[PDB]
Design a protein around this ligand. Structure first.
Ligand SMILES: CC(C)=CCC[C@@H](C)CCO
Ligand SMILES: [Mg+2]
Length: 152
């Protein structure tokens, strides 16, 4: 179950229909570090880049009545969906974000093994297509080494 998502993950790519959300300074330009399951809720420590420094924040995505849908408060309300996952290799999620009368779609790919990140970018591109994003709305994070001290 959810507990198999526990442990170390590495962010590979983001996508959004609102480019500002995933720009280098954007609300959802954050790096996953680790996840854990507690009470069937999904807990996650993320790393937030901030002017050469980096903040570690613990978030909880709360289970809902819908399988694989979670409530996450982060820059507004998010309906967080676990779209595709192999707990031992990769995880694709997307969120419907409600913030200040704006509604946006944000997707996120993470992997267990960064040397394999190329293996799963196509699966991410396909999920993005299915939720209506195009390939030019994807940002690959391989040039963004901020928070490198915390991302080991
Ligand atoms: C709460 C959790 C396990 C993960 C949050 C992931 C989003 C904040 C990713 C954003 O791009
Ligand atoms: Mg590098």
């Amino acid at each position: 179950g959810l507990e198999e998502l526990s442990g170390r993950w590495h962010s590979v790519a983001l996508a959004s229909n609102k480019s500002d959300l995933i720009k280098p300074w954007g609300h959802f330009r954050v790096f996953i570090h680790s996840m854990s399951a507690k009470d069937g809720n999904l807990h996650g420590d993320i790393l937030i880049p901030q002017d050469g420094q980096c903040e570690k924040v613990s978030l909880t995505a709360f289970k809902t009545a819908t399988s694989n849908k979670f409530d996450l408060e982060y820059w507004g309300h998010n309906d967080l969906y676990l779209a595709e996952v192999d707990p031992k290799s990769y995880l694709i999620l997307y969120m419907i974000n409600q913030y200040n009368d704006d509604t946006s779609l944000v997707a996120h790919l993470m992997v267990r093994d960064l040397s394999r990140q190329q293996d799963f970018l196509p699966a991410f591109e396909s999920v993005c297509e299915d939720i209506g994003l195009h390939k030019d709305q994807i940002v690959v994070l391989s040039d963004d080494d901020r928070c490198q001290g915390s991302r080991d």
